[PDB]
Design a binder for this molecule. Structure first.
Ligand SMILES: Nc1nc2c(ncn2[C@@H]2O[C@H](COP(=O)(O)OP(=O)(O)OP(=O)(O)O)[C@@H](O)[C@H]2O)c(=O)[nH]1
Ligand SMILES: Nc1nc2c(ncn2[C@@H]2O[C@H](COP(=O)(O)OP(=O)(O)O)[C@@H](O)[C@H]2O)c(=O)[nH]1
Ligand SMILES: [Mg+2]
Ligand SMILES: [Mg+2]
Lengths: 113, 436, 431
C-alpha cells in the first residue's frame, strides 16, 4: 500500500506493453505472403504502392513522341519470388522504387519520378 | 588448423606474391627446396604452409596470370621445386589492360579449373579461415579476373573471409591510360564481397624508395620487396603465436565499422638504407611517432585533416608492453589525433616477438623492433577522389569506353559503378557527422 | 538441498574457473590426482556440494568446461589440476567466437549446446537433491557471454525448480580486448536480469584499479586479476562450503539477499587486499577487517557505496576470532552509517563465521552486498553502448550473423529501466 513501488509499477506495466508491441510484429510479420530475402523491401513497397495517388496530370512541346511500356512479371521472376519495383498511377507518370541502403544498412526508397 | 589460402593474380599480384613468399620462407626458415630443419613433418605457420610427406613444406597459394611469361619465372627461378606445380595456372593472351576481358571473355574459360585447384587446396585443410587475394587495381587481369573470382568464391565459400591486397596505380609506372576505368570497375563489383581491402599507393612506395632508400628510379623489384615487408608485418600476427599477439581476424573486427567502409590505411615504421650505414636503433616511442608521419604511410593522403575510426599497431621484434603503453601516452593527447564521437579512442596492440628479417642485399636496413599501424581513417577517401577525377574527364566524353563495351559489357554499368563510387564518398562523409 | 552443478564458459570464464577450483580444492584438501589428504573433518562435512564422489577414494569436480576455442582446454589439461577433471565433462568446439556474442548465442554456439545439456543431464541424474547451477563467464567476450546466456536459458527452462547462479565479469576500457564489449555486455545483462536468481558482478575495470593502485602492480597481467577473482569467489562460497545455519544453500541465501525480482546484482568485497605470494608482516585485526571490507577500495565492482544504500549484506569472517568482537564491530559499521542502509528491512545484515581461513591468510573478511550503487556499473555500459548505438556502428557484425535490430533496443531499454528501478528503490523512506 506504498508509493515508490507505484513509480516502479508504472514501469513494469509498460515493459510488458513494449513486449506486445514486439510480439505483434513477429506473428503478424508472418501471415500469407510474408517471405523472400526482399521481405523488408516488399513490405516497404506495399506500405507504399497504395495509400497515394491523389494528384494527377499539362506538359510541354517536344521534338519526339517518347513513350514507355511496362511489361508484367512472368513465371521465372515469380517462382523465384522477384519483386515488382515499377508502378504507373496515371497515363503520364513512370515511378521507380530504387531500393537503396544507407551506409548504416537502413533500407530506404529513392523514389525517382 | 585455422588455415588460410593466398591467391595472386596479374603481373603485380604474382611478382609481389613471389616477394611475399620469399620473405615468408626467410622469416619462418625454409630453403627454396621447401625443406625446414626444425619442424616435425600443427603450428602457427602451418596455416600458411602445408606439410607434404618428405617434410617438403609447400605454400597454400594459387598463382594466376593470363599470359604465362610472368609465372614462368617461378618455374625457372630458385623456387621452381618449392611449389606443387598444379597450382601455377596460366593462360595465353594477356587481358591487355582491359577489365572486361578479365571479368567476361577470357576469365570464363579458366575460372572453373582455377576453382577445382583452389578446391584441391581447400580439401587439404581442417578449418580454413579465409582467402588472401593479391592483385593490382590497374591491369586487366588483376581487376577483371579478381572481380569474377571473388564473385565465385562468395558462391562456393560463403562463410569464409576474403581479404584484399590492392595496388593503386601510380602514373609514373602506369602501363595504361585506362587505369581509372579498371580501378573503378573492380572496386564496384568487388565491394559487396570483400571484407577488408588493404590499399597500396604505388606512388607512395615510389616516394618511400626515393627518400629513405635514395633510389632514383626504383625497379619493380624494390617496390615488391618493400610491400612484401609490410605484408609480412600484417600477417605476422597470423603466422606466429605468442601470448602477446592476437589474430588478424580478432582485430579485423575493430577495423571495419560499416560494411562498405573497410579500407584501413597502413603505416610502416623504420625504413632506412642498408647502404647509408651508421644507424642507431629506434625506441618504441620513436617508431610509434613515425607511424603518424604521412611519409611512412601507404596511401597518398592526409589523416591530420581527417577523423579516425580505429587504430591497430602490430609490433614485431623487441617490444615490452610497457614501452608500447608509454609511447601511446606520448602520442595520445600531444597530437591532433581525432576520433568520431561514436567510437572509443582505444588502441589494441599485437606484440609479435619475431624480429623483422629483411632481404639478403635487400636495401632494407635490418632492424630490431618495428611497428605496422592499421588506421581506418576518413582521409583515405582522397585516394578515391583522385580516381573519380581522372575518370570523370574521360567518361565525360566516353573516350576509351568502346573497348570495354566491345568485349561484352554495357555502358550503363559505367554510370552505375561511378554513381556507386560517389555514394561511397558521401558515406565517408556521413561517418564524420556527430549528434546532439 | 545438496549438490551444485558448476559450469564455466569462454576464455575468461574457463581461466577464472580453473583458478577457483584450485583454491577450494586446496582449502578442502584435494590433490591434483584427486585423493583426500586433509587434517580436518570440517573440510569434508559438506564436500559433496562441489565434488562428485568417485571410486578409489578420489574426488572429481562436478564441473563442466565449455568453450569454442580449442586451445583453452589445452591450457586446462596441461595445467596443474588438469588431471582431476572427468574427461567426459570436457565439451568444446572448433570454430572460436571472435568476442562476438551473436556467434556464441545463435550460430556456432547453438551447434554444441545440446551436447552440453547431455553432460549436464548426466551429472544431474547421478545427483540426489540438486540445488542449482553456478556459472562463470566473461561478459565482454563471445563464447562465455553468448553461449553462456544460451545455456542459462535452456537449463533454467529444463529445471525451473532449481537455482541459477552466475559470476559475470565486466568490460573494462582499461583492459579492453575489443571495442564491442559494450554490446556483448548489454545483451548478456538483458538475459541475466530475467534468467538468473543471483549474479555476482566482478568488474574488470575495478580489478585493474585494485591491481594498479592498491597493489601497485604497474602492468596488470590477466592472472593478477584472476587472483582477486579467485579470492572473492572462495570467500562468497564459504557459507555453502562449510557447516553454517546462515545461508546454508543457494535458495536460503538468495531469499535473504534478494528482495526484488530483478535486482539481484551483488557488489562483493574482500579484505585484506592481497597480492600473489606476499607476506603478512602484521595480519589484520577485527576492526581493520570490518573497516576495509566495506570501504570502496576493496570493492569488486567499480562503484562507490558512499553513493548507494545497501538493501542486504552477507558478511563472512574466515579464521578463528572473537565472535563478540565480530558482532560488536558489525553493529558499529551498521549504525555509524545508518544513513547508508535501508531501515525498512530490519536485521538485513547477516553474518556467518568460518574457522578454516583462506590459503595463507590468517583472517579475512568476505562481503556480499545487494547495493543500489551497482547502477554506477550499468550506467557506464548504458552510456558506452548508446554512444555507438546512435549511428548503429558495428551492427553488421551481429545483424550479419542473423539478429534483429529491435533485440538491441529491448536490451538498452531494459537496462535503463533496471537503473531507474535501482534509483527508485534508493529513494525509499519509512512512511
Ligand atoms: N608494385 C607493383 N606494381 C605493379 C607491378 N606490375 C604491375 N604493377 C602495376 O599494375 C598496373 C598494370 O597492371 P599489370 O599488373 O602490370 O597488368 P596484368 O595484371 O599483368 O594484366 P595484363 O597486363 O593484361 O596481363 C600498373 O599501373 C603498375 O603500377 C609490380 O610488379 N609491382
Ligand atoms: N579477469 C580476467 N578477465 C579477462 C581475461 N581474459 C579476458 N578477460 C576479459 O573478458 C573479455 C574477453 O572475453 P573472452 O573470454 O576472452 O572471450 P570469449 O573467449 O569469446 O569468451 C574482455 O572484456 C576482457 O577484459 C582473464 O584472463 N581474466
Ligand atoms: Mg599479365
Ligand atoms: Mg575464446
Amino acid at each position: 500500500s506504498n508509493c515508490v513501488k507505484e513509480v516502479e509499477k508504472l514501469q513494469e506495466k509498460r515493459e510488458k506493453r513494449r513486449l506486445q508491441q514486439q510480439e505483434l510484429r513477429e506473428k503478424r510479420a508472418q501471415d500469407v505472403d510474408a517471405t523472400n530475402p526482399n521481405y523488408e523491401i516488399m513490405c516497404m513497397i506495399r506500405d507504399f504502392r497504395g495509400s497515394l495517388d491523389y494528384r494527377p496530370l499539362p506538359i510541354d512541346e517536344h521534338r519526339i513522341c517518347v513513350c514507355v511500356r511496362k511489361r508484367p512479371l512472368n513465371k521465372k521472376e515469380t517462382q523465384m519470388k522477384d519483386l515488382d519495383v515499377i508502378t504507373i498511377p496515371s497515363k503520364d507518370v513512370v515511378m521507380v522504387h530504387e531500393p537503396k541502403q544507407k551506409v548504416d544498412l537502413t533500407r530506404y526508397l529513392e523514389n525517382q519520378t | 588448423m585455422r588455415e588460410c589460402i593466398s591467391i595472386h593474380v596479374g603481373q603485380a599480384g604474382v611478382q609481389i606474391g613471389n616477394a611475399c613468399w620469399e620473405l615468408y620462407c626467410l622469416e619462418h626458415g625454409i630453403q627454396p627446396d621447401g625443406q625446414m630443419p626444425s619442424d616435425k613433418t600443427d603450428d602457427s605457420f602451418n596455416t600458411f604452409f602445408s606439410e607434404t610427406g618428405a617434410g617438403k613444406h609447400v605454400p597454400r597459394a594459387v598463382f594466376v596470370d593470363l599470359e604465362p611469361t610472368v609465372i614462368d619465372e617461378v618455374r625457372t627461378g630458385t623456387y621452381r621445386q618449392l611449389f606443387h606445380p598444379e597450382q601455377l595456372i596460366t593462360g595465353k593472351e594477356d587481358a591487355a589492360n582491359n577489365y572486361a576481358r578479365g571479368h567476361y571473355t577470357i576469365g570464363k574459360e579458366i575460372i572453373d579449373l582455377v576453382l577445382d585447384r583452389i578446391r584441391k587446396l581447400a580439401d587439404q585443410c581442417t578449418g580454413l579461415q579465409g582467402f588472401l587475394v593479391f592483385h593490382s587495381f590497374g591491369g586487366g587481369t588483376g581487376s577483371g579476373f579478381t572481380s569474377l573470382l571473388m564473385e565465385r568464391l562468395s558462391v562456393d565459400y560463403g562463410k569464409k573471409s576474403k581479404l584484399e591486397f590492392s595496388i593503386y596505380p601510380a602514373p609514373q609506372v602506369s602501363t595504361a591510360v585506362v587505369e581509372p576505368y579498371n580501378s573503378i570497375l573492380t572496386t564496384h563489383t568487388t565491394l559487396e564481397h570483400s571484407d577488408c581491402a588493404f590499399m597500396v599507393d604505388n606512388e607512395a612506395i615510389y616516394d618511400i624508395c626515393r627518400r629513405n632508400l635514395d633510389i632514383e628510379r626504383p625497379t619493380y623489384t624494390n617496390l615488391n620487396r618493400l610491400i612484401s615487408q609490410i605484408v609480412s608485418s600484417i600477417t605476422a600476427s597470423l603466422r606466429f603465436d605468442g601470448a602477446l599477439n592476437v589474430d588478424l581476424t580478432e582485430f579485423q573486427t575493430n577495423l571495419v565499422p560499416y560494411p562498405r567502409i573497410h579500407f584501413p590505411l597502413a603505416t610502416y615504421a623504420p625504413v632506412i638504407s642498408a647502404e647509408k650505414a651508421y644507424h642507431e636503433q629506434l625506441s618504441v616511442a620513436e617508431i610509434t611517432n613515425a607511424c603518424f608521419e604521412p611519409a611512412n604511410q601507404m596511401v597518398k593522403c592526409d589523416p591530420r585533416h581527417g577523423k579516425y575510426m580505429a587504430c591497430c599497431l602490430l609490433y614485431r621484434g623487441d617490444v615490452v608492453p610497457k614501452d608500447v603503453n608509454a609511447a601511446i601516452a606520448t602520442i595520445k593527447t600531444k597530437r591532433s589525433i581525432q576520433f568520431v564521437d561514436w567510437c572509443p579512442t582505444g588502441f589494441k596492440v599485437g606484440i609479435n616477438y619475431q624480429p623483422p628479417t629483411v632481404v639478403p642485399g635487400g636495401d632494407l636496413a635490418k632492424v630490431q623492433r618495428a611497428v605496422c599501424m592499421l588506421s581506418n581513417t576518413t582521409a583515405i577517401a582522397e585516394a578515391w577522389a583522385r580516381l573519380d577525377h581522372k575518370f570523370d574527364l574521360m567518361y565525360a566524353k566516353r573516350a576509351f569506353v568502346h573497348w570495354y563495351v566491345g568485349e561484352g559489357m554495357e555502358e550503363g554499368e559505367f554510370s552505375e559503378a561511378r554513381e556507386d563510387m560517389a555514394a561511397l564518398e558521401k558515406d565517408y562523409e556521413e561517418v564524420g557527422v556527430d549528434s546532439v | 538441498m545438496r549438490e551444485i552443478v558448476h559450469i564455466q564458459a569462454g576464455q575468461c570464464g574457463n581461466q577464472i574457473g580453473a583458478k577457483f577450483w584450485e583454491v577450494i580444492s586446496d582449502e578442502h584438501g584435494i590433490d591434483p590426482t584427486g585423493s583426500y589428504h586433509g587434517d580436518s573433518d570440517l573440510q569434508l562435512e559438506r564436500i559433496n556440494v562441489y565434488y562428485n564422489e568417485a571410486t578409489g577414494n578420489k574426488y572429481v569436480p562436478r564441473a563442466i568446461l565449455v568453450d569454442l576455442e580449442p586451445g583453452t582446454m589445452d591450457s586446462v589439461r596441461s595445467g596443474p589440476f588438469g588431471q582431476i577433471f572427468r574427461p567426459d565433462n570436457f565439451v568444446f568446439g572448433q570454430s572460436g567466437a571472435g568476442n562476438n556474442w551473436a556467434k556464441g548465442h545463435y550460430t556456432e554456439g547453438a551447434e554444441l549446446v545440446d551436447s552440453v545439456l547431455d553432460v549436464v543431464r548426466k551429472e544431474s541424474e547421478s545427483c540426489d537433491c540438486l540445488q542449482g547451477f553456478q556459472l562463470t563467464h566473461s561478459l565482454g567476450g563471445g563464447t562465455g557471454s553468448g553461449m553462456g546466456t544460451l545455456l542459462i536459458s535452456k537449463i533454467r527452462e529444463e529445471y525451473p525448480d532449481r537455482i541459477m547462479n552466475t559470476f559475470s565479469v565486466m568490460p573494462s576500457p582499461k583492459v579492453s580486448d575489443t571495442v564491442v564489449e559494450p554490446y556483448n555486455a548489454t545483451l548478456s545483462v538483458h538475459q541475466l536480469v530475467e534468467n538468473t536468481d543471483e549474479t555476482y558482478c566482478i568488474d574488470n575495470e575495478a580489478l585493474y584499479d585494485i591491481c594498479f593502485r592498491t597493489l601497485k602492480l604497474t602492468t596488470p597481467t590477466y592472472g593478477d586479476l584472476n587472483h582477486l577473482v579467485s579470492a572473492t569467489m572462495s570467500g562468497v562460497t564459504t557459507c555453502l562450503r562449510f557447516p553454517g545455519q546462515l545461508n546454508a544453500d543457494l535458495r536460503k541465501l538468495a531469499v535473504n539477499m534478494v528482495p526484488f525480482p530483478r535486482l539481484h546484482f551483488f557488489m562483493p568485497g574482500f579484505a585484506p587486499l592481497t597480492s600473489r605470494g606476499s607476506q603478512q608482516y602484521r595480519a589484520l585485526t577485527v576492526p581493520e577487517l570490518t573497516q576495509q571490507m566495506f570501504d570502496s577500495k576493496n570493492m569488486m565492482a567499480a562503484c562507490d557505496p558512499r553513493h548507494g544504500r545497501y538493501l542486504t549484506v552477507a558478511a563472512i569472517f574466515r579464521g578463528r576470532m572473537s565472535m563478540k568482537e565480530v558482532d560488536e564491530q558489525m553493529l558499529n559499521v551498521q549504525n555509524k552509517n545508518s544513513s547508508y542502509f535501508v531501515e525498512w528491512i530490519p536485521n538485513n545484515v547477516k553474518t556467518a563465521v568460518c574457522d578454516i581461513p583462506p590459503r595463507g591468510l590468517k583472517m579475512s573478511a568476505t562481503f556480499i552486498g545487494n547495493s543500489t550503487a551497482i547502477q554506477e556499473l550499468f550506467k557506464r555500459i548504458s552510456e558506452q553502448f548508446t554512444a555507438m548505438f546512435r549511428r548503429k556502428a558495428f551492427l553488421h557484425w551481429y545483424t550479419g550473423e542473423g539478429m534483429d535490430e529491435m533485440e538491441f533496443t529491448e536490451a538498452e531499454s531494459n537496462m535503463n529501466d533496471l537503473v531507474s528501478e535501482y534509483q527508485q528503490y534508493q529513494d525509499a523512506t519509512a512512511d
